[PDB]
Structure 1
Amino acid sequence: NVTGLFKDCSKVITGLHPTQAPTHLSVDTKFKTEGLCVDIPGIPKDMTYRRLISMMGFKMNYQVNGYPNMFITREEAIRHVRAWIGFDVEGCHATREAVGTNLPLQLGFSTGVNLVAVPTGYVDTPNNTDFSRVSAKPPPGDQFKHLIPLMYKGLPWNVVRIKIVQMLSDTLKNLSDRVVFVLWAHGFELTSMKYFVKIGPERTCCLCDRRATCFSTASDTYACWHHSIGFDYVYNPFMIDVQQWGFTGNLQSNHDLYCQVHGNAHVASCDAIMTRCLAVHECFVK
């Protein structure tokens, strides 16, 4: 019984030394005996590895006192319709030194904004995890052709996350005290959130009584949407996966049952606009 969360995507045929492996599963078979591991004299640690670790498969089903639930009910989402932001991500695939995981490339929102990131992954090394640019390519096929020029238009993640916070703040400061990301098949959107969301207990802003919606790694401070200039992380966002409301078939077919004004332009922002639009038609129209 294993999970894909934190799968090692490197092409190294062998596992790690007992002192470097993050887990018993990741120790190489040569060290395993009698239900545990042994140190073998003369078998050295590896001092030059770079192993890409997959961020696919997060499970946000904890129940910890004072930490809010990220995923919310349809009833709670409806009360917070003004906080709804559709979100979709188009990925690229790890290649060359690694294979088997998806990296965020184009992040799209119902505001119409698309942001393009440099393909970046979490690479384990002998000393730490290096959050760094990794080799990547768009998936093969004519439906992924538009992503080809985006491979050389990416911004580093430290810049992308500041832009996400600024866009959400500008959109929501006069509409809500929170954000509700409206998703369709959320797994990859949740993997992408690892790059720009932090969580913790409910906090109040540094300059007022409003709840904190942003965090700054520069000063370890919290801010609401009005006081977040320069902040790099979204803090305690909420979210809902519309696909879980019983729909059959793809996003476009369900969106088109209610709406004809949003033609599919095959881009992350369009999927994000269609997801929010479908959720609005389902909950508020007729």
Structure 2
Amino acid sequence: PTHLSVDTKFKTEGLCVDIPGIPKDMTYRRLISMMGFKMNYQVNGYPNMFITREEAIRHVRAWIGFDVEGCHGTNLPLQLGFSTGVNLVAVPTPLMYKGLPWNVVRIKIVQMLSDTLKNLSDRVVFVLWAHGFELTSMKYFVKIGPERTCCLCDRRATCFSTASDTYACWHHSIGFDYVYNPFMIDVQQWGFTGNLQSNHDLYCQVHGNAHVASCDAIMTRCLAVHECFVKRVDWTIEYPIIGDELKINAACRKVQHMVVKAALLADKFPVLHDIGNPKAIKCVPQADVEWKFYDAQPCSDKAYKIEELFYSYHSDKFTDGVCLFWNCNVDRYPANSIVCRFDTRVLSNLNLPGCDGGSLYVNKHAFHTPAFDKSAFVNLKQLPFFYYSDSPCESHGIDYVPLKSATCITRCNLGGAVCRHHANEYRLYLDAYNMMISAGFSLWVYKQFDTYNLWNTFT
């Protein structure tokens, strides 16, 4: 059960308007053949063009929704739409391009997929709501064969060039004209009633149906993200490292310890309500405070309602002390809170577009996050940058320029001159903070938080 057997049945009902008379009895083997591809009993790493839902979930970064709309066929021009917002018109002689022959369209497809996917994945997974034209058009821009490696590097080949007869990955495909060994999955095989728009609109109001192929390509990938990440959650699936994953995770842990430790020193709360991960650990283990944990898994659909998290009868008095919501996405935070909330609008190789304004944040594990909403933070303010340290001023053991900063809250800065140790530590902390912010995280705190209250912890 590693790959999808070519002898598996393919439901052809959704294909019979573009392909009238299509046999009801159909396998992947006969379908790939009908599409104009020959597999030739090849045991060479590419057993099927189509993959399982489980293999698709493991390769979510490679997903590219794809739709082809005809006219009134090899007589009519076709509009090719991708979930990148691109629409290309192919002739057989929201970015809208006028009609061009396949020999130039294929060149543009290779460029577009390579630029979208080079920093995301080692492949492309065409996400379909198959009606016929998208499958019969693949022979015009896709070549298949044995698994290969890039001509300029060790990555698997994703493109082919008829000009030089060579193969390339997404990073080395400039000038390549064919998509090599792509993958694909037909969402319509999962058991749905009604068309694409009616199933998509049950869960999402952010994507419309402007009647261009890219709108359908966008809805198809959104519907697949909903089915695989919103209504079905698998936090056991691991995803490869493609960027700053480790630095960001280390930075988040550093910022969390810093912000919570300073909030407890500045306001001396007697109790802290830690709402979120059921496996959470005290981020400030030495703090005096009464630490109380409340379990809530990451919400992937809609943000938690504070009324359901807090009410229906625990300290019961969440109004006492401070509440900590570290990536616990709620509709409206209470005024006495410390909050880390992921901003779904952030553009990054870790953040993929999601369902209903939400985003799919993929960092070791895939987490669909509900749409960022500025009104969740109305009882709070943005947490300002600051570095706090009560550790001794001692170097131990990278050349220096003296640090001058009003936000370096240390004994040495109180005393007029930041020491080398606290200056190095401040700069490392500022780097970790900037990495977390730029990765998409936002920090919020109760309105009374004032770092001026940290200076008297050095007396």
Task: Give the superposition deviation at 1:188.
Answer: 1.8
**Among candidates 74, 84, 90, match of residue 111 of structure 1:** 84
Amino acid at match of 2:84: T
Q: Which amino acid aligns with 1:86?
A: G
SS in 2 for 1:117: strand
- What is the aligned partner in structure 1 of residue 175 from structure 2? 230
Q: Which moved more, 1:65-74 or 1:163-172?
A: 65-74
Q: Does 1:240 align with 2:240?
A: no
Contact 1:213 1:222 in 2 (8 A): yes
Bigger relative contact order (CA 8 A; separation at least 6):
1
| CA pair 236-91 structure 1, distance change in 2 beyond 3 A | same
Distance verdict in 2 for CA 1:249–1:102, change over 3 Å: farther
Cα distance 1:270–1:115, how it changes in 2: closer, same or farther (>3 A)? Answer: same
Q: Which has the larger radius of gyration?
A: 2
Choose the corresponding residue for 1:66, options 44, 56, 81. Answer: 44
1:90 is aligned to 2:69? yes
**What is the deviation of 1:263?**
1.3
Partner of residue 260, structure 1: 205
Would you say the 8 A contact 2:77–2:99 is kept in 1?
A: no
Distance in 1 (CA, whole Å) between partners of 2:191 and 2:161 is 38
**Is 2:156 the counterpart of 1:177?**
no
> What's the offset of the Cα at 1:175?
0.2
The one of 187, 190, 194 aligned to 2:139: 194
Divergent runs of 4+, >2 A: 55-64, 101-104
Name the CA distance, whole Å, in 1 between partners of 2:76 and 2:137: 8
- 1:111-132 deviation line (CA, Å, top 9, x unaligned): 00001112x1xxxxxxxxxxxx
Asked whether the 8 Å contact 2:159–2:180 carries over to 1, the reply is yes
Comparing 77-86 with 256-265, greater Cα deviation is found at 256-265
Distance in 1, Cα, partners of 2:37 & 2:203: 31
Name the CA distance, whole Å, in 1 between partners of 2:34 and 2:72. Answer: 16
Going from structure 1 to structure 2, the CA distance change for 1:167 and 1:112 (only over 3 Å counts) comes to same
* 2:80 equivalent to 1:80: no
Q: Secondary structure at the match of 1:106?
A: strand
> Could you tell me how far 1:187 is from its partner in structure 2?
2.8
RMSD: 2.3
For 1:64, the aligned partner's letter is Q
| Distance (Å, rounded) in 2 between the aligned partners of 1:180 and 1:157 | 21
Q: Partners in 1 of 2:45 and 2:194 — Cα distance?
A: 34
Structure 1's 109 and 194: CA in aligned 2 closer, same or farther, altered over 3 A? same
Letter in 1 for 2:61: R
The one-letter amino acid of 1:80's match is: H
Task: Output the TM-score relative to the length of structure 1.
Answer: 0.64
What amino acid maps onto 2:214 in structure 1?
S
Three-state SS of the structure 1 residue aligned to 2:71 is strand
User: Match of 1:117, as an amino acid?
Assistant: A
CA pair 64-187 structure 1, distance change in 2 beyond 3 A: farther
Aligned residues between the structures: 196
TM-superposed CA distance for 1:105, in Å, is: 1.3
Percent of paired sites with the same residue: 90
Shift of 1:104: 5.2
How far did 1:157 drift? 1.5
- What CA distance in whole angstroms lies between the structure 1 residues aligned with 2:75 and 2:223? 26
The 1:260–1:61 alpha-carbon spacing in structure 2 relative to 1, beyond 3 Å, is farther
Counterpart residue number, 2:166:
221
Inter-partner Cα distance in structure 2 for 1:81 and 1:185:
19
Q: Return the TM-score normalized by structure 2.
A: 0.41
Deviation larger for 264-273 or 58-67: 58-67
- 1:34 aligned residue: none
Distance 1:103 1:183, change over 3 A: farther
**Residue type matched to 1:254 in 2?**
N
Deviations 1:171-207 (A, max 9, x none): 0000000000000025321111111000000000000
Whether the aligned pair in 1 keeps the contact of 2:129 and 2:196 (CA below 8 Å) is: yes
* Mapping 1:50-61, distance limit 5 Å: 57-58=34-35
- Secondary structure, counterpart of 2:136 in structure 1: helix
Find the partner of 1:206 among 135, 151, 173. Answer: 151
